[PDB]
Design a protein around this ligand. Structure first.
Ligand SMILES: *[C@@H]1O[C@H](CO)[C@@H](O)[C@H](O)[C@H]1NC(C)=O
Ligand SMILES: *[C@@H]1O[C@H](CO)[C@@H](O)[C@H](O)[C@H]1NC(C)=O
Ligand SMILES: *[C@@H]1O[C@H](CO)[C@@H](O)[C@H](O)[C@H]1NC(C)=O
Lengths: 99, 298, 226, 29, 50
């Protein structure tokens, strides 16, 4: 413990990043944005990146189920990943303008 | 070490007629009072499933998946063994279900010629690449215990299904009637390439084997018409491979089809030979005077 | 459960080198520290070196620095110890001891052994290895009680002592009094065993004394007859 | 041909363009 | 430096932000990647060589 700066113990560790045919392994810590439910805003519920109005309907899903779809080929209800809630994404306000 | 009790005369494989049972949720999507058609690896209805009575543990292949229906009054069947070679040469996988938890290890194990259940199933272990805790356990009197576990492997995922329901009637080792859905319990990012299957039976001799039976049923790609109720559960389904009434119900999705004639399929008699007809050989090339010549120069 | 089998060891000249191994089996060779500790015959033990769960040297003694180098191989699950410039004070039973704790990240350095092995006799001298001499001790016909007659072997003329005697295949754990060896003022030793040997009526052991000596590798399969 | 899933479950397959030799079996036009 | 450990990581969620919390005077030179875009790509197995 008297050597110069160029001879002190240096703990060196390198990291290797492989990419093979494997399932969805470690990728990013997380990403949250403090979800607020008051208006029509964008949402990202673990893959779904559509638009709509969060309403928190009174549906009764199953534990393994995470998404909800009626007969429209489009998601209309999602489960919050953090809190075990049952939401309902009704689409934003749209229509047609007549003069 | 490998052991073998006495009174083990003979038990040749048998076959049973599995009724409408073995439908699982193909996706994590909620559906209320609507029908849905999906193309996945399901179990055909009225198929021919093996009848291994647990009163012998052969190594059966794992082509696309198994059903593994079990009816017993104990906890003798509490493990499975997966792998392509079932030795220390390639990777392996086992799913042991302890009396208080479930463990899964992908160490490069080395199984003997007759695994049986402690950890006296493998001789030499190796490094694992994946492990999971499995806080709950996966696997009364007249009411026995019915359990079935569907196993698949699409790209790297296992996606184990399970459903336990007490059977109230007694039958000479036959699958019960009714309908039952397989709920997805755990998923595995393990990513192993398995091609064979092996079960794990407990002994508790201290012989007391009880009575059980595992029904291994291979899965085939079919198209089912599910019946999602208003609470997300499945009430019934259509195999779409039975009598043409089934295919009519598929192409006219309902369960109260009215009176009339409907076009459902299209027959097609399919080939049975690969005949190739070319003309005769003639005027062979002069390769008999260049490979069977007399003298060369240099 | 834990089987810390140790390989490598024998008679070597002072000033040479050898490689010791300890193949682990039963636990995971990625979360338990394994050390090396010698034990002179009837003169206590002595710690040599050790490695933590990862590849890390925890130090040496005050007499093995610069000559001994320990290495860990997590891929093959075996701990190795290199010995250079062996002297006369390096003759002891080098053991392969494990550690009880899992060696978590933030703790205090405190290593204590939990699983021990058998060790390999690493003798360092100028003598040479000698071949054993097994002899079929005659089970004399003195018959007073049931098992008063006894037969054994008369292994002698061997400098190293990694002696292991077998009877049929490495079995018959019944009463077998294997007497310790003794230096007969010439460096050699002498081994002998005594069995029950009940009334011989073609219903007894195969009369075989398998003696394995690593520095003098030779498979002796001579039988014993009255 | 199906009377409907309300009184019975029997059906009657009707192939089109087959002489009943390339598949009671009757031959209509 | 000749006998380096190689730790095999399994399925988890790696937070590449505590790496710059230790004592000062530490390098963070990457090769082919960047710390700002580190938590964007997906990797199967990461090996640490000490
Ligand atoms: C997620 O974290 C929130 C906040 O601590 C907690 O209330 C919630 O129960 C957690 N959910 C799960 C399933 O971990
Ligand atoms: C669905 O849940 C409701 C409310 O509990 C219940 O009245 C109804 O019978 C259930 N239907 C089924 C059996 O799916
Ligand atoms: C060469 O001659 C022999 C004997 O006639 C015959 O069997 C062989 O096929 C000939 N090879 C060639 C190159 O045609």
């Amino acid at each position: 413990p008297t050597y110069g700066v160029g001879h002190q113990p240096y703990r060196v560790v390198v990291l290797s990043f492989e990419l093979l045919h494997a399932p969805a392994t470690v990728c990013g810590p997380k990403k949250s944005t403090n979800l607020v439910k008051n208006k029509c805003v964008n949402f990202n519920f673990n893959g779904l990146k559509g638009t709509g109005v969060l309403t928190e309907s009174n549906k009764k899903f199953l534990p393994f189920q995470q998404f909800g779809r009626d007969i429209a080929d489009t998601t209309d209800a999602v489960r919050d990943p953090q809190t075990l809630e049952i939401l309902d994404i009704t689409p934003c306000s749209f229509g047609g303008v007549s003069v | 070490q490998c052991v073998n009790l006495t009174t083990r005369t003979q038990l040749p494989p048998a076959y049973t007629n599995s009724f409408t049972r073995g439908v699982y949720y193909p996706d994590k999507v909620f559906r209320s009072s609507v029908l849905h058609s999906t193309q996945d690896l399901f179990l055909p209805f009225f198929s021919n499933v093996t009848w291994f009575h647990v009163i012998d543990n052969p190594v059966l292949p794992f082509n696309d998946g198994v059903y593994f229906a079990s009816i017993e009054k104990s906890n003798i069947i509490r493990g499975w063994i997966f792998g392509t070679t079932l030795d220390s040469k390639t990777q392996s996988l086992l799913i042991v279900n302890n009396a208080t938890n479930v463990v899964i290890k992908v160490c490069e194990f080395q199984f003997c010629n007759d695994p049986f259940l402690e950890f006296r199933v493998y001789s030499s272990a190796n490094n694992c690449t994946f492990e999971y805790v499995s806080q709950p356990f996966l696997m009364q009197g007249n009411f026995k215990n019915l359990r079935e576990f569907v196993f698949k492997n699409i790209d790297g995922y296992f996606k184990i299904y399970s459903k336990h329901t007490p059977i109230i009637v007694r039958e000479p080792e036959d699958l019960p009637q009714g309908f039952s859905a397989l709920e997805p319990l755990v998923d595995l990012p393990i990513g192993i390439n398995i091609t064979r299957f092996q079960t794990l039976l407990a002994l508790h001799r201290s012989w007391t084997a009880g009575a059980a039976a595992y029904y291994v049923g291979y899965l085939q790609p079919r198209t089912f018409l599910l019946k999602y109720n208003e609470n997300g559960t499945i009430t019934d389904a259509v195999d779409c491979a039975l009598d043409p009434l089934s295919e009519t119900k598929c192409t006219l999705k309902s369960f109260t089809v009215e009176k009339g004639i409907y076009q459902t399929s299209n027959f097609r008699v399919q080939p049975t030979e690969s005949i190739v007809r070319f003309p005769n050989i003639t005027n062979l090339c002069p390769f008999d005077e260049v490979f069977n010549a007399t003298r060369f120069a240099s | 459960e834990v089987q810390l089998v140790e390989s490598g060891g024998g008679l070597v000249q002072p000033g040479r080198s050898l490689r010791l191994s300890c193949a682990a089996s039963g636990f995971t060779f990625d979360d338990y520290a394994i050390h090396w500790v010698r034990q002179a015959p009837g003169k206590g033990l002595e710690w040599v070196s050790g490695i933590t769960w990862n590849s890390g040297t925890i130090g040496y003694a005050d007499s093995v620095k610069g000559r001994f180098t320990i290495s860990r191989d997590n891929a093959k699950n075996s701990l190795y110890l290199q010995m250079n410039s062996l002297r006369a004070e390096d003759t002891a039973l080098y053991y392969c001891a494990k550690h009880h704790q899992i060696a978590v990240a933030g703790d205090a350095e405190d290593y204590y052994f939990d699983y021990w092995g058998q060790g390999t006799l690493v003798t360092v001298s100028s003598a040479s290895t000698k071949g054993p001499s097994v002899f079929p001790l005659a089970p004399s016909s003195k018959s007073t009680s049931g098992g008063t007659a006894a037969l054994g072997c008369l292994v002698k003329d061997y400098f190293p002592e990694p002696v292991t005697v077998s009877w049929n295949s490495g079995a018959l754990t019944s009463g077998v009094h294997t007497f310790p060896a003794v230096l007969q003022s010439s460096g050699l030793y002498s081994l002998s065993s005594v069995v029950t040997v009940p009334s011989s009526s073609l219903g007894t052991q195969t009369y075989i004394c398998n003696v394995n000596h690593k520095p003098s590798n030779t498979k002796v399969d001579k039988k014993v007859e009255p | 041909i199906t009377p409907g899933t309300n009184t019975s479950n029997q059906v009657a397959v009707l192939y089109q363009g087959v002489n009943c030799t390339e598949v009671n079996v009757f031959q209509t036009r | 430096v000749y006998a380096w450990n190689r730790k095999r990581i399994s399925n988890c969620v790696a937070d590449y932000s505590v790496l710059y919390n230790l004592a000062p005077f530490f390098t963070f030179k990457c090769y082919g990647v960047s710390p700002t875009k580190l938590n964007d790509l997906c990797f199967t197995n990461v090996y640490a060589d000490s």
